[model samples]
Each structure stands twice: as C-alpha cells, then as structure tokens.
Target: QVEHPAGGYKKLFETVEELSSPLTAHVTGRIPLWLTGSLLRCGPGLFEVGSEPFYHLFDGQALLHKFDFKEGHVTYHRRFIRTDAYVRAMTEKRIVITEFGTCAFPGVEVTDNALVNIYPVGEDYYACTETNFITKVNPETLETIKQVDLCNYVSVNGATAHPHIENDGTVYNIGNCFGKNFSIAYNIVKIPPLQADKEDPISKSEIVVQFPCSDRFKPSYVHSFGLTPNYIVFVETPVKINLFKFLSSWSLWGANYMDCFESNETMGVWLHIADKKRKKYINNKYRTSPFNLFHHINTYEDHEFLIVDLCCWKGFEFVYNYLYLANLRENWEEVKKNARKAPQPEVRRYVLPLNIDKADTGKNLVTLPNTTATAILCSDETIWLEPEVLFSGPRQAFEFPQINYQKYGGKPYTYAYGLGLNHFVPDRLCKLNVKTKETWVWQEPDSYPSEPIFVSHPDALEEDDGVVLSVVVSPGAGQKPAYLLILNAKDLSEVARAEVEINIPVTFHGLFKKS
Candidate 1:
C-alpha cells in the first residue's frame, strides 16, 4: 500500500518511516496509509483538494491508487498492486477487483491503524481484512456489510493477515502492539473463522493474547508472521530503550540499540499453533532469536522459515549496517550469547560505518541466519556479513576499500541525505556464507536498482526456486529512467532487465505476480 504516516513523530525515525527519507525526522501530518497508496492512481496535485492540511503524497518513491464501490473503496501500492490487478492481470472476465481499486477520499483515522494482507484460503474465496475493527465486505456487492468499531476498548496499531489459508476456509487476522512503551497495554488479537453453516459472514470474531512485559524485556511488536496448517510462526521484537528514553524524550537522544542498557530489545519468537476450532494452541519457542531491529519474516518449508534482524553498526550517527539471521531449530542461549558478542570476524565483508548515511545497521533485512556464529554445520547456520553496509536494497553486491564517508565527491554533503545529515550511498546485495563467514558481492554491471522483488511460479512465499525482479535506474546516476529487471534466484546473475517506456521516477517498495 501507500507510505502511511503513523501519526506525528512521537519517537525517533517515526517521522522518517512516515513521510521522509529513512534518515531525518518530519511531521507529514495525519493521513491513513490507505491514502498514501492511493496517490499513484490519480496522477498528481492531490493535496490542494483533500481537507487534511500539510498532508501530501509528493514523495518520489511512493504512489497510491484507489477503487470505488457502492460499499466503499480499496487502496493499493503503485508497484505491488499495479503489476497484479492491472499489468499482468488475465484471470477474470473484465478483471473486476473486490477491494484493490476503490477511492479513499473520506480520510480515516491514523492512530488506530490497520493493514490489509490477503491470501488464498479455499477454492474460490481469497481472505482479506483490516487488521483491527470490523469492515468485512462481499466480493460482488462491495458493501461493507459488517462493521465493528474497536475505538472503545482497544487502540490497535499493527496487524496483518493470517499466515496461511485454513482448511475449513478462513484465514487468521493477527494484531500486535505498536506505539508507546511495552506495557500492560497489550493489543495482540487473533480472529478466527466464522462457522461454515452460519450464512452471516464472520465479521469481527477475535482471540486476544496479552503477555505482561517485564523490566528486562517486553514484547510490543510482532514484526512478522508465518502461517501453517498447524501453527503460526511469530516473531516478537522488543524495544529495550536506554532507560534514559524513559526519563526524557526519545526525540533528542536516540535509543542506543547497540547496548542492552540503552536500546529496547527483543525477547525472541515462538511457534503458535491452533486447531480448527481455535480452542487450543501449541505455543513453543524451540528456536530462539537474539536480534534488535527486525524488518520482515517469512517461511521457507514445512517447518523451516528464514528470519532477518539487525545489530547496530558502531559509528557516531544513528543505526548501523550489520545483518543477522536465525535458524529456529537451535536453542536461544547460544544465539543470544553470540548475537551480542560477535564482531567483524576476519573474513570478506563490507560495512557502512555510522554517520555514513545515518545508516541503522541491520535495520532492514528480508531474511537472516538462524543462529549467531558457528564453526560450520549444514543444518545450523549463522547468516550475516561480519559487517553490514548501509544504503537501500542492494540489487546485487560490489566491493571497494570504502572510505565510509567522502566529502561527497569533494562537494561534501551534496545530496538530500547530506542536506538532512544523511548519505545516499548506493546499497547492493551480497551472497554470504555463515560456515566460512565469507561474502561475495554480486557486483553486476552498472549501479543496482530499487524495489527488487523475488518472484516464483508456486506463488507468494514459496520455497521452489524462482526469479528476482528489480527496477534499474541505469548508469547509476543522471536523469535516466528506471527499467524492470528479472533475474534467477539460484544465481544473482541477471536474466533480463527490460526497460519500460514509462517514467517511474524512484521507488520504495516492490512486489511480483504469481501469474
């Protein structure tokens, strides 16, 4: 969807993730994420009309689109949705979308927010819903036949779709805590399916689970969820702020994630399984994690999943470039010890020291090692470049005896990143090996691209090897437009990066079609 402004900057990077470069803080005003993804549909000049002041979708990277029905509207991310519901769409007659195309001019509240993640559940129906509250609609009518106003009891901030579609047909709706410190205030909910015999659609059924947060750790965020017929692979990321963030405002002195005493940390994750009735659960954490800032989590096979987390890159500025991985089959004690102690081992590596781009090392990872460090074991692995490099998604990898920060080609702080004390060092991808702690930069010809996605034939989050798609803004720099690229997953080698005639400017997110 669109780049949602989860309200004003109540904390560090709150403004950045909302409506500015990942560096620097800004108040983009109040606008639902649904609105952010809608701007792309209507070419330009959306701000002057919306009643919301100071709220504009002018960011070069994001574009939002909307659809309409007698019921309401459905919003979509420019690239993620544009590719599926439009570009590659060929399944239905006239290809009518249930929710991905409606308009969002009415402006919803941003505080108690929700995100819609859909997945296949049964034969004909696809499961999709708002994380919290009640807004269930029919495919043909587009009417929001059900509405459950959750504003009274709880304030839901984060949510997602059930990891997988269930056997009896209905997916799970998962909600987690967001905003504010980890407290008795728990907002994690698991909504089960409606009875099959019952004609009325299951509108707002729920199962709320809240574990008390202790002084040493608190589970406030469920960064991501993986679904299975028997269990929901869940990762709970805890923010262990430097006790100082409690005394004063996190606005000035950022949480030192590098040190436990300074940062808000995670207490690892667990596997939660529920039967068809949703009465019982197999809750266990056979494999534990020792990660700080985790971005996304996905499953690979029947019982295996890949998780990515971050550790601070030591530098003067905020965030670092270290990426860590976890294989849950192992224990947490070993992972925890090494996760915090391991350094840039004597091996091939690349690092973007702090202040280089205000790089939050290990900030955003699509996947990571299951354990910390190990000698060499095929079954157990520790995935991470001894040192992580800062910048956006590295389409591939390269090497250089980088002098972390230069005077910007002698110009010094020349780019926008420089303007906000940031640096836009081009980030490329690398192929890393945990056994030997070796990394080879997939240095492709020319600079890398933006929003490269991994595509396949089996569908979303499948293990069968597939292809990677990216948007290359060739020649690295200049006014040259970006092109679409498709590569093999087995090797980072380029298969084909087809050029598009459209002017796509810059991009922040990417997704591919199952078709």
Candidate 2:
C-alpha cells in the first residue's frame, strides 16, 4: 500500500459552521481581473445530527459554498441547503432521514439530501443528490428557493448529479426507471433550454431514450454518462443496485442506501449508445470486461469511430463500502488495509466504431491512428471492446475529471484536469495531456483539493490558456486556512489563492458561473 500521513483525513469529513452572509477572504496573490463570476460548490457539511452521526462520507447535510469574484476581489459565503433531509434532521434533532450509509427511521419519503452536486437546469440552478428531488437555489444569494421532484416531470426514480449541459443550454441526464411488466431500464432525459418566453425548461422535459437492463431485478449504478455532439453514451457496469433489496431493506429492515448495493461479478460492462440527433438507440451491442466507472473525461467523434474516455476502477468490487467515515478515519495501518480493498482508478480510452453494421467477423473495426483501443466484431455479433490505458498507477487515481468544456466538449481536444487520489483521499491536483499521456501534478503536504474546474480566458487561442479553480483544505497543524486555489492550467503552476478562516469540508461537482 502507498504511504500517507495519518489522522489528517478525518478533519475533511467533520462538520463545519455556515456563513450565510458574504465574508471577504484574504487574498494572498493577484486574482485575474477578467475572472468575474461565482464558484458554486456543494458538499456534505454537517456529519451528525443529535446523538446520531452520519457514517458515510456522502451522508453529511448539503452545504453550499460560494466564492464570488469581482474586479479581482473575492468574497466567501456558505449555507446549508434546505433539503427535506437536512431540514427534518435539524427539526427533529435526530437522524430522521436515512442517508447513504446512515440508517434512520423509515420515513415516508426518500432522502433528498442534495449534497452531491450543484448544476443548472434551464435558467435556474439546482443542488442535487442521487434522489429524484433537486433543490432550486438563488445562485447569487445562496438561498434555497424550492424543491423540485424530477418524477413529477419525467418517469425517473432518480437522476445523476453530473448532467451534460450543451453549448446551447440544453441539459441531458440519465436515471433508472421501473416500468411495467417487471421491466427496469435506464432512461435518458432531455431538459430543453430556456425558451424565448421565459418558460420552465424542466416542465417541458421528456424522455429521449431508454436502454433495457440486463437483469430484471438489478440496474447498474450510474454516477455520470458521456455526451458528444452526435451521441449520448451510457456505460452499464457490474456495480448494481438490487431493486428488491433496495425497496425491502429500507422499508422493512430500516436499512440505508449502502445496504442495498451489491456487485454482480459475472456481468460484464455494457456500453449503450444513443443517437442524439435522431433520439434513438444504436443497434450495435457493445461489451467489455467488468469495471466500475463514475465520471467520464470526455467523448467525441473521430473519423469513423467515437472516442470515449473515462475514469475506471477495475473489477466488480463495490468501492463505496470503503468510503465509510469509520474506515477512512482509522489509524495508518487500518487505513492502509482498508485502502487496499478499494480499487485504484485509471483513465481509459475506448473507441467504438460507428460503421459496424456489416463488419466482418473476428476483425478489428477501429481504424483510428495512434491508439491501441480496439473494437473487434465477435462471431456472436457482439462488439468486444479493448481499451487503451491512458493513465494508471499502482495506488494513484485520476478522478473528478474536468476539461475545457466550453470549447472542446463533445469534440476532439486535449488537456483534462482532475483531483489526484492516493488511496481514497484527494492529495493533489492533476493535469493530463490525453494525447501525449503526460501529466503534471500540484501537491502540498497535508493539503486536499476538490474537483478542479477549468475557466478559460476570453481571448485565448490555446486549449490550456485558462486558470484551474479548486477549493483546497489543509488540516495539518499550523498550516494556513482553507483557501480557493487558482493555478495556471497549462502547467499546474499556482497563480492566486483566496484563504478563508473557517474550515471548509471537501466538496463534489460544481460549476463556475460567469457574471
């Protein structure tokens, strides 16, 4: 196992106080004058309610953090989102709602923590978890407006927090849907852009495509999906949620979300493609070895094939089990032991041939140059994919990937940024050159950074002519306070940082909304 300093990881999961009003942060370096916007971040802030404590890293109450930038000045603000889970837990003074790993009373409604991510839905912004409920918030004030259930608009049990937003403002998300005749499938939902009349885009949402599940009782756990200009990609991994277990365990046994998840090793990963323009599923059957995937780096169309890059963990092991706060807060020896049980992640590139309708048997269909990723047509008419390992290490993982999306999203490009994890804890910031497989890292002793969000320069011609933004927290004794870090995207060099006095818990996915 890889060696890391012990005992510091616990501070990141600890509960922190909220600042409803804006507090000016002490700027150490110069912030770019052109960088005028709000860096909206969402994550778990309160880990315990009353005598009960949330066990999982993901179970903490939703806390929204905002770093406002204007004319080179930065102000920090934070508030707990008024989701039902947080509200009821606070009101009852106990764990009234069950969370990912914390089991509580069998409530009448599902837990709508909305702590995982904050995204834009049409003209409004929403804080989302994995449940069907998403809370709309005032982005400028960091105040919760209303709770919107996705099922009221579309037939989805829950949608992923990582939705694909197009250049034109359209948004696409994937979720599992339980249909008639004991049928379960993954539905691709489309929320149109805000129209001319200032209508509710989510109210006009509709299901675009549905991919049937391989097992009737189980559907693969989907955290995120892939999107290009022409296609929407879904990778169905072996990490599945047993619907029977999920429904019965929560209701009868008072089990939490983590108790219902199980891995099916025999089931390999399945790749489903949908034609975005035509709104239909592609007939090609694509399969690969079993692996667990959470975030997609990027997806784009090449000459005759579609290139899909993803951060994957090998095997069918349920990685979430190792993420429990108990396991992470242990001593060095126990932490190493638990970390080994978790799968190490790697960045993989897989190519799918679009013209495989009449391909010859036992022949490779991917004709892309400078790549070892292959798509071979089997005798059984299934396309077997072999991926090219773009980045890998013994105990390191490149996850929470971000790219130059405004220009290169859904198209072929380079330069992706992400958080570097050393055995389940984010210890560094990483920048990867996908084409060259070269990487640059920014690390500080006992410092943990969140997902790196890329903000491009207005007049930049180069792909990496931008600054990478990340909320960095240092828990070590005598270290500086938690700060919002700015790095030159081209080389991972530090540009500026705005430090806050309060302890900032680690956050998940968010966006930089330009003013």
Which candidate should be chosen as best, given lDDT against the real structure?
2
Ten residues in sequence with the least summed lDDT for candidate 2: 1-10
**Superposing every Cα of model 1 onto the true structure, what RMSD results?**
17.7
Per-residue lDDT over 1-515 for candidate 1, one digit per residue giving the tens place of the 0 to 100 score? 01112211111111111212111111112212222111112111111112322121221111221221111222222222222222212243222221111212212222111123223323222212333443332322222233334444345533443333344545454554443554433344543455556443333434444333333333333334444333333443434334334233234432222232233333332223333235454332222333333222122221232222122222111122222112111232432333343222111111111111112232322233433321111122222223322322211122111100111111111111100000122234443332343433333334434433444334324231454444443442342333444445445565543343323323333122221
Give the residue spans of candidate 1 off by over 4 A: 1-108, 111-157, 160-173, 177-205, 208-212, 215-219, 226-229, 238-262, 265-290, 299-426, 430-448, 457-464, 475-480, 501-510
Model 2, span 1-515: residue lDDT tens: 33555566677888898985998989987898889999999999998896788899899999999999977689999999988888888788888877889888623578889888998877799999998999999999999999998989999999999999998889999999986757889999999999988989999999999888878878999999999988999999998888788678655666778877888878789998999989899878899998889999999999878999999998789888788888877876777667776777789999999887554789988877889999999988899999999999876889999999989999999889999887887889999999899999999877889999999999889999999999998876777659899999999999999988888987998999999
In candidate 2 the C-alpha lDDT for residue 37 amounts to 98
- How many residue pairs clash in each candidate at the backbone level? 42, 0
Per-residue lDDT of 491 in model 1: 54
Q: What residue pairs clash in candidate 2, if any at all?
A: none
Output the lDDT of residue 513, model 2: 98
RMSD to true structure for each model, in Å: 17.7, 1.4
Query: Scored by CA lDDT, what does every candidate get?
Result: 0.29, 0.88
